[PDB]
Design a protein around this ligand. Sequence first.
Ligand SMILES: CC(C)(COP(=O)(O)OP(=O)(O)OC[C@H]1O[C@@H](n2cnc3c(N)ncnc32)[C@H](O)[C@@H]1OP(=O)(O)O)[C@H](O)C(=O)NCCC(=O)NCCS
Ligand SMILES: CC(C)(COP(=O)(O)OP(=O)(O)OC[C@H]1O[C@@H](n2cnc3c(N)ncnc32)[C@H](O)[C@@H]1OP(=O)(O)O)[C@H](O)C(=O)NCCC(=O)NCCS
Ligand SMILES: CC(C)(COP(=O)(O)OP(=O)(O)OC[C@H]1O[C@@H](n2cnc3c(N)ncnc32)[C@H](O)[C@@H]1OP(=O)(O)O)[C@H](O)C(=O)NCCC(=O)NCCS
Ligand SMILES: CC(C)(COP(=O)(O)OP(=O)(O)OC[C@H]1O[C@@H](n2cnc3c(N)ncnc32)[C@H](O)[C@@H]1OP(=O)(O)O)[C@H](O)C(=O)NCCC(=O)NCCS
Ligand SMILES: CC(=O)N[C@@H](CCC(=O)O)C(=O)O
Ligand SMILES: CC(=O)N[C@@H](CCC(=O)O)C(=O)O
Ligand SMILES: CC(=O)N[C@@H](CCC(=O)O)C(=O)O
Ligand SMILES: CC(=O)N[C@@H](CCC(=O)O)C(=O)O
Lengths: 424, 424, 424, 424
Amino acid sequence: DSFVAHFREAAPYIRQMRGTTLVAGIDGRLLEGGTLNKLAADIGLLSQLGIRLVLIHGAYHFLDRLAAAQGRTPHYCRGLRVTDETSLGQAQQFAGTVRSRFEAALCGSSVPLVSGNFLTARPIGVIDGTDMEYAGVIRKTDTAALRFQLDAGNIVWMPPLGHSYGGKTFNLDMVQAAASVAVSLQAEKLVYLTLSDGISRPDGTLAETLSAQEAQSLAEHAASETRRLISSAVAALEGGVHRVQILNGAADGSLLQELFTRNGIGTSIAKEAFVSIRQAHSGDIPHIAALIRPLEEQGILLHRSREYLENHISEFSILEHDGNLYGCAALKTFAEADCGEIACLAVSPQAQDGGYGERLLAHIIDKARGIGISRLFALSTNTGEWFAERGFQTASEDELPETRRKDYRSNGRNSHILVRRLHR
Amino acid sequence: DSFVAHFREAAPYIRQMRGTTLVAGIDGRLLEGGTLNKLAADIGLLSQLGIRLVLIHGAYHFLDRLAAAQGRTPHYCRGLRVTDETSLGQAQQFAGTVRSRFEAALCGSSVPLVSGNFLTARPIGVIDGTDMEYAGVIRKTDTAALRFQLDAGNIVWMPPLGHSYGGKTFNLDMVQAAASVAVSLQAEKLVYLTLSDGISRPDGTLAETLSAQEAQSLAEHAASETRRLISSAVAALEGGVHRVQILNGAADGSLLQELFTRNGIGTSIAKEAFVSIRQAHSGDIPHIAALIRPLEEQGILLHRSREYLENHISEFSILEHDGNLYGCAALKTFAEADCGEIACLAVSPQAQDGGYGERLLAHIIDKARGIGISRLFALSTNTGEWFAERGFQTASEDELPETRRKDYRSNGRNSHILVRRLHR
Amino acid sequence: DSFVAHFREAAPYIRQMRGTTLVAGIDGRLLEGGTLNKLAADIGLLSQLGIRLVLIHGAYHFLDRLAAAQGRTPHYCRGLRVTDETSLGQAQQFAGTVRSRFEAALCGSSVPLVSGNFLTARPIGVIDGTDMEYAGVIRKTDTAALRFQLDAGNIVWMPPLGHSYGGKTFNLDMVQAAASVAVSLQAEKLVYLTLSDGISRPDGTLAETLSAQEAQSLAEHAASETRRLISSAVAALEGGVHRVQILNGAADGSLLQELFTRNGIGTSIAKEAFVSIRQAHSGDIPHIAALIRPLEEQGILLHRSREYLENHISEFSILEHDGNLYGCAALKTFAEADCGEIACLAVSPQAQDGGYGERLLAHIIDKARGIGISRLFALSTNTGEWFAERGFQTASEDELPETRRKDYRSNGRNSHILVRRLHR
Amino acid sequence: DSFVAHFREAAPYIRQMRGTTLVAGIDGRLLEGGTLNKLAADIGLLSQLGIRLVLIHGAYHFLDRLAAAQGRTPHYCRGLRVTDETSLGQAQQFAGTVRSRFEAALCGSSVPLVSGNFLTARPIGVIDGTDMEYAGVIRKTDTAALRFQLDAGNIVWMPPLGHSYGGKTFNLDMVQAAASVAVSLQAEKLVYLTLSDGISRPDGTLAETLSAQEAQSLAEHAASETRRLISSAVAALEGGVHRVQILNGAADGSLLQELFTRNGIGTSIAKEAFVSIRQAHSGDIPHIAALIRPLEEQGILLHRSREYLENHISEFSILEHDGNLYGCAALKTFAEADCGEIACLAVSPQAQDGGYGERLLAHIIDKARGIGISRLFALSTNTGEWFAERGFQTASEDELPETRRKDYRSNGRNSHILVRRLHR
Ligand SMILES: CC(C)(COP(=O)(O)OP(=O)(O)OC[C@H]1O[C@@H](n2cnc3c(N)ncnc32)[C@H](O)[C@@H]1OP(=O)(O)O)[C@H](O)C(=O)NCCC(=O)NCCS
Ligand SMILES: CC(C)(COP(=O)(O)OP(=O)(O)OC[C@H]1O[C@@H](n2cnc3c(N)ncnc32)[C@H](O)[C@@H]1OP(=O)(O)O)[C@H](O)C(=O)NCCC(=O)NCCS
Ligand SMILES: CC(C)(COP(=O)(O)OP(=O)(O)OC[C@H]1O[C@@H](n2cnc3c(N)ncnc32)[C@H](O)[C@@H]1OP(=O)(O)O)[C@H](O)C(=O)NCCC(=O)NCCS
Ligand SMILES: CC(C)(COP(=O)(O)OP(=O)(O)OC[C@H]1O[C@@H](n2cnc3c(N)ncnc32)[C@H](O)[C@@H]1OP(=O)(O)O)[C@H](O)C(=O)NCCC(=O)NCCS
Ligand SMILES: CC(=O)N[C@@H](CCC(=O)O)C(=O)O
Ligand SMILES: CC(=O)N[C@@H](CCC(=O)O)C(=O)O
Ligand SMILES: CC(=O)N[C@@H](CCC(=O)O)C(=O)O
Ligand SMILES: CC(=O)N[C@@H](CCC(=O)O)C(=O)O
């Protein structure tokens, strides 16, 4: 495929990723092989594409490679590596040689790269009667300082080391350092660059996209390591991060291909914000009426009525928060078994603009589909593009279900008509 | 070829083009067909890639399309279209419908797009007894205002219309408006988006790259239109612009492919700054000595001598400005007919850092090559990377011409040795 | 009258209008005659006087002038002109020739003038079974971009055209575009430059100033056009704009004379914020007591008492929001039928500083006046200037009603005394 | 001595050192002992006192401590340590453990500390037939980036490592890295924190202050190490740095005591800018006349004359640049052998304000003193404070030498009279 076409494809993801903040937690194996030059390069490019970068690396696998081979053996607890004064000493060494090679590798393939005492750690203390010693976790993170450097366009490099006010240095767990740093920054995107093609489902297939929930539920049968990715990824999301990804950093160019294709090459994970949508029943009707009535008076909605509603209350859905009714949507059906209609779609003007409408539309389309409906219509007098923009084609009178074509004729409204093909 | 590989290729040109200013002069035919959506898109992307954009369009072909078809016939003079009060009136119309379609087309494929009274025109007046009437040329261009908008990241749109202080509006020639605007902005790059795959040489082949000189000399036998491109492109360059390009705007994605590949798809043109390099002769020697001597005292250069030089003054070149000697370089030869050496390469410390060294290196390599030399050596004690960076590989003692290997041994200097393969 | 005196008069309105934002909706007839040079000039001056300017123009009258004269006839619906693909095409033309003439006219009488894709439209869709086609209304307005340009001192020019995300361009109604833009900007002032000396009352007299309410009520018997001015002017105000004006843009210099004289030459309209003020009755007394008591303990208010109040509860007014009592004020009377006193004026410290005090003062003065009172006194120990500033002159003991002069003597407070002449 | 008095003493040096840039080159032994906490603390304080800090550390002594103890033995050349791929590897380790301890030590005694890829090195190459291998020197130093961080108030930390464009990392000599960095920054002050109480004179006494010249001349008989301090300190100065100091970083609190006392505790070094001052002779007189005459016409100088001057040309000095005469000053003597007068002090108005006047004053006072003069008078009608400010006390008529008191009386000028006691 041609250059121009690849470039024209990436264009939209470049748009999206621009001026946005991307926290990367990098396995330290990656900072060592031939795999490091590829990765620094891909990261220069990101910088070039106007993405704000914070980069954090781990040390566990290097330490052990030095441990097992010193005679000693590392214990982990809940995953967290007990770190003594000698391991801590090597982690300080490992960080200097890494930060320096990554620098060279980046300078060799004028991109400004900045490191900082942005972190204050406290020791994790004791877990299940075990002194973790120098194992830290982040107590404070100098957010203003960081934004300042990202504002200026510097790529931030962070080793897995914080300092405490007592003048002691602690060893930080990369995986949950990064996620903590992302939540501080409210970064749009946390990326973990592992040695694995993402997270696998119950049977060997790699999980392309997952809700925090699905992620959660894969964990019960998942391996230590991928279990802790999942929790930090879940916590990063609930903490405000928009999207956390898992890639194989060792696979050539994966970062690019993940960020700037319609496809990807790893797992990505997203949080399903709260919205209780359910089958309307007898009690909603006064609410729905109050919601519906203003609109049905402006001419934006067909005029309904207590009995209309009372007798079709089953074809309606409502969206609710805290007992409060914020929206509704109904599915009409027809003698044509393939057809359907989104009807009576309404969100309160107060609670508008946060994807409520969308959620009801989606919901209905799930329901139209569970009954073998494959074309969904939507007619509208002042709102057509909401649907044109969200996957509906223009249609004519002659295309409606026969009956709906009758009503349409003797409406007098001339609503615009649209449809959207639903998928099996 | 894979995505990642295309992207990894563009990466360097993205680096270069970033934060840089690109003035585009666009034929107005392009703002009309299906060719406009492609082009707006490609231009959104540029914006996305951090390039400062100023865009200017023409009107000549639209006017005439309206003229010939009104009964009237346009005269041009030296290429400049006499424009009456009615043509001027239509150009104002044409500009509003263009700026608005390009807007829609860009909004449809959140990129900020800004238009401005940045130009003050005066009428061209009379040429060869002919009143050009409303044909303007730019008298002043509000540069601070423009930088301000580019600083903020707006894409600047400019119609081919300026206003004069007497309250009159003039019609501007696109081709030399853009080049004028670029010189004001000192833009790095002026791009002309024509209906032609660039400029053709004496025999049908498209001229990939050209010096302003070669450009110049193609003009004597070239067609009106491409003659005026050439002059404005020459004037833009001498006026300070770094590089002017000519592409076919109608060819799909050409802009991208031009800017972000090692290849291209149009013509590009560059100015050969002034440097008089010539065969050293008897008179230079005191100069060369003064230049050479400090260095030959620090140990950076083999030690020469009046007679050494006097008897080999033919193997030397010198670089000179205003009778002043600013650098030198010599080509040694050997019993091996394929071999050569760059020797005695020196630029004054005052006049360093502007590509003087490079120019002498190049020069010598032209000369080594005109005598069938295909490997050029360079030995150096403190300056090796200058050559490693500029296309030389490391070598060993055992690889030198036999004689030079002798001298090398009984030097005691241990110079590093490098070579570079010259091309037929 | 002398220069200096005119200038010294304008000085205060210049103070007020400085650094303030003024959205102007301009009838497009104005952009055409000799009336355009005058108007551009007056608008340069505004810019010179440090006023932030956004200017938006209409197209309806031009379109029709082209329509009726093409054979075709425009339908309007609720005032909104159905606009086809050919009208939309001309509106794009009309905008380019206008923006360009206004530019020339402004450049001819160095004031920076900036145009922008600040608007995203959606089509109005269908009204009363009628496809409005390309008739848009503004869906989003890039407010940050606009403030940015106004911050820099540019005059913003806006044609009556937005674009939609589907890549289509819509025709915008000027009158309610401007008001929408003002509300976005929260501009202090929206000015509509019409062809009429403002809005006329029930009997031929031009309405100098009006509350949104009075405006509203003039509408029931008013003409289509002036009916829609009124609604957009009402909506702009409720939407947050401080003041909307209606002038005759064709009348020479009206804009100046409107903005910088104590008088004006058109209609102006202002919103009466919410304040329920009413006759105190038996139930308020505990509230009034709690409000009054702290103050009556600091020495700022004469000391009252349950019975005092109980027996004069008729001379009191209270101000209330949401059943909450936020202030009070009483009118005392005297054997002198011309006299009155503002007594017991108090607002809670929480709800202070928003013109509550003023509203009660006003209120009382309405009431003093409805009983033929023409001098209102106010005595005060620590608050005299509140009244000196708000239209009261200093007075002496010997000027009080005889009885109040008695009380004053044997007070011991030495309150300052002031008065204000009320008008028939 | 009391707190207040110490603080009131430091106040002036705090004034001077504020907002000023201080580059510190630190021996790496210092980053290790108990000596590190003291030093980080003193450096926090500096930061607190508004001084811009760049800090750079060495590695030579650590490397060798690892070398001698590995079996290997380091060669130095001209002082520069040949560094192989394994030493370079350890220097990367040493830098990470240092930067991290200094961090902890600073965090333990909220001061922001910033590290950066500010340096690009090239290898030193070959010296006297010896491959220095990975021994670098700085080729480019990102000055804008550095000022940016100092502007923001960050303390800059720099390890002794740069990177080259070929993707290789080099080992930098601390001593001449710092001085190079200072010259780039044009820092006011370069401080070298050694293990020695400054530089010793020919006989064991520590050299408090030295001109670059005196420094220079101490070097001929000085030890390798202190020889290279001297050259880098000389080059930093000629390169534009205002003042370079040498202290014992291991001595407790020396940095403070050096910077904020009238005394110090180490050596300091300063450059004697160019000014040729010499005994006036017959040829200067026309110059001196032209210089003198305007002034002698304004009344600022006693009126002289060709013969006056011709016959006393020995009591005059002149200051000259490039054969050009820019100033003059004369010493009068008296029957009182202790007395003297500065007479005829004049600098051209063009070349004023750069300490020329001062230099002539000094000069004369050297000359008055070499003839046993211990009081120097200066009389002046419009210039008294120049002398009051520069160490002269007010005097009366009755205090002048007897003869000068005569002239003074029958002048009519009433010059102010001042004196200054010169020291044996
Ligand atoms: C259309 C509606 C139901 C969407 O509800 P919502 O919860 O705001 O929906 P979402 O937040 O998912 O989408 C909001 C977005 O849709 C856009 N939208 C809202 N009204 C629009 C319209 N009439 N035309 C086009 N787009 C519109 C909003 O501008 C907003 O744009 P953005 O994505 O660039 O911010 C709307 O809120 C509503 O109730 N309008 C009046 C009732 C109506 O038209 N109902 C049925 C139509 S037949
Ligand atoms: C090498 C030299 C001749 C280049 O001359 P020049 O006119 O400055 O050459 P150019 O301007 O084309 O190239 C200058 C660039 O080369 C780089 N350069 C200069 N000396 C360098 C060196 N010793 N090592 C690596 N790069 C060096 C400069 O840093 C500058 O870097 P930049 O491209 O990132 O700005 C140099 O100026 C010189 O005379 N040095 C001393 C003499 C010497 O070494 N002569 C022969 C070497 S065997
Ligand atoms: C005087 C008072 C009743 C005004 O109430 P209010 O609702 O704040 O009145 P407004 O908001 O219309 O006017 C507020 C302004 O009046 C000014 N004002 C308030 N107290 C003032 C005083 N004692 N002297 C002068 N001006 C005063 C406020 O500073 C504010 O100034 P600004 O216009 O530059 O912002 C005041 O709030 C109050 O109750 N003070 C104590 C009670 C008292 O003095 N009552 C009667 C006086 S005899
Ligand atoms: C006084 C003079 C000789 C000093 O020469 P100079 O080379 O400028 O001396 P310096 O640069 O060392 O000192 C310059 C400073 O002295 C100050 N100075 C100059 N004239 C001054 C005066 N008349 N009163 C007080 N200070 C003065 C300048 O303002 C400048 O102030 P700064 O230290 O805050 O910048 C002056 O330049 C001069 O020639 N003035 C007229 C001739 C004259 O008065 N000669 C003899 C006086 S009896
Ligand atoms: C999608 C939607 O809510 N449609 C409106 C009908 C609009 C019309 O038919 O013209 C409804 O009443 O269901
Ligand atoms: C390229 C160059 O100028 N070389 C130096 C030689 C350096 C050496 O041989 O060690 C020259 O004298 O020609
Ligand atoms: C205006 C007002 O509220 N006055 C205070 C009286 C102040 C006085 O008389 O000194 C009042 O009690 O009515
Ligand atoms: C210091 C100096 O130059 N003095 C002036 C004299 C000023 C006076 O005596 O009043 C001089 O002629 O020497």
